[PDB]
Design a protein around this ligand. Sequence first.
Ligand code: NA
Length: 82
Amino acid sequence: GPLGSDADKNDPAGKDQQVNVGETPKAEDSIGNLPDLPKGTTVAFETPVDTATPGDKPAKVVVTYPDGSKDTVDVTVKVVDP
Ligand code: NA
């Protein structure tokens, strides 16, 4: 059988973050263990996050490992009016 992928061997953990209206969150701030993922792993939001109004915004972080395998994490970006 084949050697497993990076995704098979890693488990990124989602993290909620809070931002103010208008701010642009970074996908890195929605992952709680990025140091434990392989060097060279990238993280991105699947879709840009809406921060034009307050609310709990669901988002997905796509975690792409150097071998091309991927994990997703479902997270929440909380937008508040300051
Ligand atoms: Na995984």
